[PDB]
Amino acid sequence: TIYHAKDAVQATKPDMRKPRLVVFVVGETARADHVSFNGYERDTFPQLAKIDGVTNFSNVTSCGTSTAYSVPCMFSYLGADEYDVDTAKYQENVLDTLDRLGVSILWRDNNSDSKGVMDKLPKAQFADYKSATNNAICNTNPYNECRDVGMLVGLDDFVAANNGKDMLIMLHQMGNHGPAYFKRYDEKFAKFTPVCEGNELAKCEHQSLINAYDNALLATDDFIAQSIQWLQTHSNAYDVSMLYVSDHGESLGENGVYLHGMPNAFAPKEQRSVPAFFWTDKQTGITPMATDTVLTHDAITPTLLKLFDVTADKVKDRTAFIR
Ligand SMILES: [Au+]
């Protein structure tokens, strides 16, 4: 392990102020420009729009264009300019630091896995929610595909067993993962029709592809709202906050390009322009940065440290999502 924050200290402890409870949704394949709040022509986030205290960040660039590359960078101390995907797994990352400091770290995954982020931590702190041995919400669709909202079930049991501690829960979404966007949402989210249902994107009518993509955003809108609603049920005992950032965007036929993973050197902007939301309870004292702050995945690690009142030299001056 190569360390970067051995100096990290927590200024205030959960035995002398309210314990802090944060959900970080790690999104999947969502594009900034298909978000209602960023000026998209469709209301793709109706439920989040009903919730007070949500900040939408209109200028966020992902570290990369793929799950393997972006997800470790999101939790890195190095920043996009110095990040090396090939050695990322051996670097101390922001979750190693918080866990060392006594924050209870939980990773639930309905996507793939943590791409090495949870590897130095006890396996008991990672849970696979792609399988029904954990996820109670899979038989709601003709594919029996397990749903992101299933990662919320039983979180009260996790809180109860971590009584009075700081807690950071990562929820790694299936989200808008392609090519089969149509599979990614239940029927209640099939607002935009007709929809593409083949693995040959490009052979699909372009509008029908967009329609399946947008329906999957409505399922994500629903999941993020439910996440905040779950947090609100603990807001008296805990200072609760919710951070959402997508790992990367998606090409939807622009210049003949589909899916993602284009190398950064020639990747279209659609693959790196991602949405980000921050919600917090009024009690927490946490203040969002300006909506239009130029932001990147580099802001995640300082944001997670500030949420728990932790300082570390390597990111002392680094712009975050919050003050
Ligand atoms: Au991804």
Curated annotation (Swiss-Prot):
**After translation, how is this protein modified?**
Phosphorylated at Thr-67; may represent an intermediate in the catalytic mechanism.
Q: Enumerate the subcellular locations listed in this protein's record, separating them with semicolons.
A: Cell inner membrane
Q: Which UniProt keywords apply?
A: Antibiotic resistance, Cell inner membrane, Cell membrane, Disulfide bond, Membrane, Metal-binding, Phosphoprotein, Plasmid, Transferase, Transmembrane, Transmembrane helix, Zinc
Question: What chemistry does it catalyse, as a reaction equation?
Answer: lipid A (E. coli) + a 1,2-diacyl-sn-glycero-3-phosphoethanolamine + H(+) = lipid A 4'-(2-aminoethyl diphosphate) (E. coli) + a 1,2-diacyl-sn-glycerol
Membrane topology of this protein: Multi-pass membrane protein
- Listed as disulfide-bonded, the cysteine pairs are C63-C73, C138-C146, C196-C204
* Function per UniProt: Probably catalyzes the addition of a phosphoethanolamine moiety to lipid A. Phosphoethanolamine modification of lipid A confers polymyxin resistance. Confers resistance to polymyxin-type antibiotics such as colistin; in the E.coli strain W3110.
What name goes with this protein? Phosphatidylethanolamine transferase Mcr-1
| Organism of provenance | Escherichia coli
- The shown residues of the full protein are 219 to 541 of 541
